[PDB]
Paper text:
The scaffold contains an ABE, a consensus −10-like sequence, a 13-bp transcription bubble maintained in the unwound state by having non-complementary sequences on nontemplate and template strands, and a 12-nt RNA. 3D classification revealed the structure of the [name]-loading complex, determined at a nominal resolution of 3.3 Å. In addition, σR2 binds to the −10-like sequence in the same way as in 21Q-loading complex and RNAP-promoter open complex, in accordance with the observation that the −10-like sequence is critical for [name]-dependent transcription antitermination. σ70 conserved regions σR3, σR3.2 and σR4 are displaced from RNAP, probably due to the steric clashes between σR3.2, σR4, and the 5′ end of nascent RNA, consistent with the fact that σR3, σR3.2 and σR4 are dispensable for σ-dependent pause. The N-terminal segment of [name], including L1, L2 and H2 forms a ring-like structure, while the C-terminal segment of [name], including H7 and H8, forms a helix-turn-helix motif. In the [name]-loading complex structure, the helix-turn-helix motif formed by H7 and H8 participates in the recognition of ABE. Specifically, residues R128, K138, S139, T140 and H142 are positioned in the major groove, potentially making interactions with DNA that could enable sequence readout. Our structure of the [name]-loading complex reveals that the N-terminal segment of [name] forms a ring-like structure and contacts various elements of the RNA exit channel. In particular, H3 sits on the exterior opening of the RNA exit channel and interacts with the dock, while H2 inserts into the RNA exit channel and interacts with the zipper, lid, and zinc binding domain (ZBD).
[name] positively regulates a programmed cell death pathway linked to the virulence of [name] by recognizing an [name] binding element within the promoter, then binding RNA polymerase directly and allowing it to bypass an intrinsic terminator positioned downstream. [name] then positively regulates the cell lysis genes alpBCDE by functioning as a processive antiterminator. In particular, [name] recognizes a putative [name] binding element (ABE) located between the −10 and −35 elements of the alpB promoter (PalpB), binds RNAP directly, and allows it to bypass an intrinsic termination site (tB) positioned downstream of PalpB. Like 21Q, [name] forms a narrow ring inside the RNA exit channel and renders RNAP resistant to termination signals by prohibiting RNA hairpin formation.
Numbering used by the authors:
A (entry chain D): 16 to 931, 947 to 1126, 1135 to 1376
B (entry chain F): 95 to 168, 217 to 239, 247 to 451
C (entry chain C): 147 to 230
D (entry chain C): 1262 to 1356
Amino acid sequence: EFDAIRIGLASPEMIRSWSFGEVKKPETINYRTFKPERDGLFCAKIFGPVKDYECLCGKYKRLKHRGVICEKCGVEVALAKVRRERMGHIELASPVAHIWFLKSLPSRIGLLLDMTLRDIERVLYFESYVVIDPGMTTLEKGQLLNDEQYFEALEEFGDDFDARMGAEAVHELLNAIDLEHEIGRLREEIPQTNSETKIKKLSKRLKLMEAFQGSGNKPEWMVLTVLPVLPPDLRPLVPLDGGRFATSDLNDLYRRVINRNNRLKRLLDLAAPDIIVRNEKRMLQEAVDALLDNGRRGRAITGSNKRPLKSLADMIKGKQGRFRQNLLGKRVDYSGRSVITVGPTLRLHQCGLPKKMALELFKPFIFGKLEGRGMATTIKAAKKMVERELPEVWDVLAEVIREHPVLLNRAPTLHRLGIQAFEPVLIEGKAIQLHPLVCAAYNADFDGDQMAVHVPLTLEAQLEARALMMSTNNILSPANGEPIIVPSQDVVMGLYYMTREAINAKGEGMAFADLQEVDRAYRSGQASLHARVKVRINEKIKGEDGQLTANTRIVDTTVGRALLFQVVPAGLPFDVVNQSMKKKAISKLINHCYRVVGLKDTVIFADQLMYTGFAYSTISGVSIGVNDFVIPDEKARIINAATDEVKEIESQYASGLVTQGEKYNKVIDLWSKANDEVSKAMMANLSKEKVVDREGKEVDQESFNSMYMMADSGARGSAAQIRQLAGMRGLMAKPDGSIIETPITANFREGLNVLQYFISTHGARKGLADTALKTANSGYLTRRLVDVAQDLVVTEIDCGTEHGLLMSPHIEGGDVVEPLGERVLGRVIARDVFKPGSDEVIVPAGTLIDEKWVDFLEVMSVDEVVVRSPITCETRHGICAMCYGRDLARGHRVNIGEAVGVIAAQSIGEPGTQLTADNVQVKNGGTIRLHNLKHVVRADGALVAVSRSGELAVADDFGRERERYKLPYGAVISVKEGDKVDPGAIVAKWDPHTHPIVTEVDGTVAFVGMEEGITVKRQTDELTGLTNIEVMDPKDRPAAGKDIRPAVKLIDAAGKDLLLPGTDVPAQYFLPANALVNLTDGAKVSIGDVVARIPQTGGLPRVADLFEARRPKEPSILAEISGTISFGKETKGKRRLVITPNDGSDPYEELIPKWRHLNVFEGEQVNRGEVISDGPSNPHDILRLLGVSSLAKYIVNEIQDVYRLQGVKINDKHIETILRQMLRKVEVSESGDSSFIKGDQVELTQVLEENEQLGTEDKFPAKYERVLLGITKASLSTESFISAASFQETTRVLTEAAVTGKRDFLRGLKENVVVGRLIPAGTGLAYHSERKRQRDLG
Amino acid sequence: RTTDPVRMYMREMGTVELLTREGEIEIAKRIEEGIREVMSAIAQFPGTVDSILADYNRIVAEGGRLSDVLSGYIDPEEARLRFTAVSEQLDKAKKALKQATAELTGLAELFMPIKLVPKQFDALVARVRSALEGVRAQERAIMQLCVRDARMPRADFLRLFPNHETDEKWVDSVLKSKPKYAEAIERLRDDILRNQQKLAALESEVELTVAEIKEINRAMSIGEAKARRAKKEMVEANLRLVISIAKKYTNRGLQFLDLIQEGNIGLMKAVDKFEYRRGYKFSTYATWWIRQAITRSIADQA
Amino acid sequence: RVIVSQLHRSPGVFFDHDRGKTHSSGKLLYSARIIPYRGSWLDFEFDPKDCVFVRIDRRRKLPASVLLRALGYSTEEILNAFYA
Amino acid sequence: STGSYSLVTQQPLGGKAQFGGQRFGEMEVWALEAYGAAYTLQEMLTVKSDDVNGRTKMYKNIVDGDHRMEAGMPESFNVLIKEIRSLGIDIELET
DNA sequence: CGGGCTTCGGCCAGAGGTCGAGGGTAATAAGAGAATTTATACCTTTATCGTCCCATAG
RNA sequence: AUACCCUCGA
DNA sequence: CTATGGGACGATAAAGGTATAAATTCTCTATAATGGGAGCTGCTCTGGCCGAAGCCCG
Ligand SMILES: [Mg+2]
């Protein structure tokens, strides 16, 4: 065994140790005799023998001496496999710099010499000298000299100045670094300079120097004086048929390097002139650079082809970018594929398998069984029987297939559900038969899809297939507890048609003694499928745990509902099946049955539902005909009216009265209203388009029109599509996004004109083009999500912490978006839950909330609860099994070893393909309550609230808040806390239209410095619209009026100076430009009076932005520290708003440029959490100021809005898991034990602080600040280098690991995947634990 | 910050300019002057002259060919007369080994116009540099011995010892200087003296002293440096020709720089085998060698 | 085998003024581009600070005055011919 | 079921024409990881492909009717090791 | 009034779904002739190892 | 039995 | 009277000589010839990285 794969620089001595010879000849194989030549790229002396256990001459052919090397044949006789491990070396006449440590964005060789990459490139390209060992001379070691400059320096000095050129000079510089002295000097000079940029550069210098010192790495090794050569089979020449040979790019590059090296030696040995020698050295540097990588500087090309050569960097990068196609993809055996086909006679656990595919896949199993039964003696006979397809081979094939599950997956597997185990059944054909109910999970229709089939071999593999990924096990979606193996289109249609009702039908009225009599009457044809009848039933209810009570009851229902209830298992009431059985109702029924009865009865119920749905959709000859699309009669009248209106509006525009810009909006609004009215009329006609006779007088009933059934049942189609099918198509958008001024009046039944078809083509082309980019972005996003959240696996059971996130129902707006029940279902409680009256414990502790608990919480008036979240659970290297709540694919709590991180990433990324103001008006009646409001009462009781943080809530009678609204600054509210307000009332009468400035104090104000023409302007509007004064702009004012700002000095009614609480200075708010101060100076202004009034995306890109924690073009400016805010000096061009908190004055405040509008009013509480200027928030400021839980709530809500817009439901556990993975790193402020500023894992800092507490001193513990990293940045910054190297930027991370000397302990999922070990999660957890037991404990 | 290597090759080479054919004649005259100087230096080494007499004896005994020994002057019968004269000069110089110095100067004058095949040139160079290597090795041996054992100071080392290396005068003088280091030297008298006996044997083989051999080898080195400088000037002149001719074979399955470097090697070979008395332009002869080099390079890569 | 007809940008001159985030400002009347049937492509960019820069297909941005002078226009004749 | 593999990386080739097998790419490997199924994943990326001494031994086990699945180490990781070494950066193990 | 110091603008790197499936295309010209090394081929000389006669120890 | 290009399906 | 060590024996394989044809690399030819050319232009964003230009500032 082994562990902890290391990475470091290759020493010339260790490079020699690796090699088995010195490659010296460029050519590979002689054209006359086809054996590799001496000292060539395939020489037998170096790389090994061509034929296993053979030599060059054949002197020794026996298989006995496997290590002896013959006398005439120096090529040691050994196995042919050895050509894969044996490498050689090339001795270069001069050293050449390594391309990776040169051209990486932070140049390691440049950083180690404190000289810019440009200067090093000048030296390497033989353009300028560099100075080595300055000695006692004016020249410095870092000084570069030109030809004339160097000649002058040599003439002036003569000696004591070693100046060189090329990579030889760089090598001479590197080995004279004296890393100890440089580290000491740079550490001494690190705190001397207070510049942030310089301190950052010297900190990076320190990091590199300490990495080199600790890692046992030598700086001179960066410039390789000797380079290896790949073993011949890893750079093979695959002979083309016809005697041609196909040479790999590696062979071409190696040949080029060898040729240039041989040229170098034989031109230095004859003392060629300096210019040509330096040109040859440059060529050798370029050739080695092209061998190592390409396109960085030179972009070398091949012969007679514009395609660049493939270097080793591109080889290790793999295909598909950096996603290793050989170490992660790894085409497998015992596999096949074919087109899929629906099999309606299949049970949920089994799938059809063609005879030939099954016979080919299970061939070794068939051979084994044939030999065991003795029917075949030699394997040749077994092959003859299996190829003859003798009748007895089908019996043994059936025996090997009986209990051997197989794996089926679609091409894009967006989640674990995309590959499930099926117990194959032999079928006659070439297509793979699929169960209809698993198509939804696979997202696989039968329009040409193909599926790959894989045969697990080991008993471990078969048991994992049967116990974890058998199709019956995964009924519920891992993304949300809602079922995924649910009736789809056709079976939903059948079940819906069965459970309908007709006003008058054959067989209506009589009573049936049992469901059996109902079936007997229906099959005999004496009763309609949907006829209102009476039937008594024997339902067994599971109301009490462990006690199944059966009761007999007579229910008024239909024949179809009674028939379908005969399928329902024995734990559910009949009332669950007495409705119309729409798709959502059926899905909820399956979900309820799973959580009540079990799993086996649930799969039986699902199979029975599918069978009956198919049977009764076949019995009902439902069909689509031209008469089914019922065009409403009023559509013609509505269209004519709208055409008359648009003609009138066009005439008005021609008159010039109406502007084109307003006419566009008017006509689009008119046409949208007409389209909505037409659609409403069509739906109202279609839905009730049934007139029936009930023993005389005619009556109406729900329609039996086929298209209406297909919509209402939810089987297939939507109202938006019937809007096109039977109503006007409505407005359509031009490619620029502007809605075309004329709509499509015709529907698909009437047929569109040519122009309308062309517009619909605009729309359809836009959508179809968007689809492919949506798929690509979703794939990239889910790949990044998986690679950032893979190491997270449940390890502990209960971490022990009591921190979590306060979860409350999402009530953004007037309606409840998500009830509290759905948010905390399957979660775990973090603290006590209390009644409306305290001291009464409802939910004690971390009890996993289930259906019973959510019903209990709904019965009580619990509104806000705190639950344990993965962002909590401070356990190290994993997550506790509580803080990650109930598993979603299973009904119970998660089990140790569940890779919830990968499940989270798959859950978030799977539905990506589905992606792309004055006053408050209370909705319903409820007791109004205030939250986070800080305002004093007005003179008359207006209660104007100037605080920016504040909201208005209308709590229900029970106590839960039914609706909440954001109350803005300066809002007058008729405070009636505890007094119920009727629905539609306007309790708060805010009307900002401006930035009002409240006046918390009263008295006769003293507007000091109000200059009419310099600071203010008594400009009155027309018709005496305002008796006020307009403040003069700072630049529009005079030279002296530019610096003068109006100030309303705080005085009382008699002239007494007043000041705001907390600060001695008065609340004399300045009046800036564009102000509205109506109150006369010296007039008593009431408390809260308005003094100064100043007038003021979505889809996959948005969720990607949130998961990368990006900064938009204009981020929202937020307050830094809570306290007394000030005014920003606009003269300097950037507003500086100093903050003076009452608890402690901190004068530090940044300057915000006035390029973006700032809506901040001075003289109020800063409220660090609050916002200073509008705009989309920058995830960071929220994290570093509001906290972690606040950032968690904001990010979760932001992602969930995007997902809920398309109606896809995803549990928040997954988003919180990804958030935990991103917040995994923290930066340190005052270390005492580490570097000043460093990005270290929070686990590392926590461990260091815990050890320091019980250690040398007590102050050794470090203080740190949490930092947020994007997924593409958090994934590349992992401690393991193998995980990052196979994600992205392989070169950068590999060079960083090389210089840093990183070690990778294979303790993640991808590490064990690439190295071929058992996964540290799932069933490999036991193996990993035993390995840890045997390793750590001796 | 151009990254194109061809571009910087053009920049660095573009400083030098061409020259008319009289300039080529002058450069070839410089080459001839250097080789004449080094050959005249070789004349002051009796072993080399005896070796050229032996090669002539092989010529007469048909052990060597006319084209494998001589390369003209500034038919074998003129060679007969010239080597008879040089042998008579050698014998008259050896007879009176004062006036012997004048006799060797006349010997160098007579052997000065002669020109020989490069193989014999490298043989003569190998002999003289081997004598130099022996002297230098004795220097290093004595130096490491005394410095690392007796701690005898480097100042008196580089003051009194040099240029004799053969007589007991320096050992005795250091012994009479009476430091403790001279007392420690007495343990190392035997090895140093027997190595100096070998040096004296080498000198008696060559009949010359250390200072004389140093003078001749220094003059030969100066002549070689002059010839090397002339060749450098000439090849830097013809770099333009080599790039111009290298244009023909770009897409021949080989890089441009490899082609021009092989053509450069060919043109240095051409310079090594170019004479001005042919009365021809250089380009005519350089084209053949450059074509040979480039074509062979491309043929090797098939 | 069949040669599928290709549709490509027509040779001539093209003017672009699409709103872009490169300037991080309101708007910038973008470059004027010349495309030949065969030969080098000339672009007439427009700097954010109300300046015109010209770059050949395979070069960096250079001030339009350099090209104007190289064409033979005087440093004062061009100003009078264009600005007034 | 079994057949000739690629000469550089000992993995089955692709496409009916070269026999060949379907590839458990990154997404399907993630899907197996989301399941607790690690033994089938390890056997899938170890025994069915990329292991010389594993394939033959697993064939033996299947023929005799026992399913032991001695793991071994994939050959593609060895290829990666030699390529990284040829890039002049050392790789080893801590044993 | 030079100088840290923040900020901004130009420039380069890297990354962009998966799994199929099929088809096609993949890369040239000095002769002479001299010389040096190398694989070959025959032959003799010495040691080696298979081989058996012979005296003797029990 | 290696790389590009083209076309096609989900 | 028999099994075993001891010594004689001899047929041959390796070692060295020793030329010898293959073969495979090396060296020459003398009007003159004295800075190459394909290189794309229709991503898109993000992110980092230097380098320059305002911006406080004492
Ligand atoms: Mg489909």
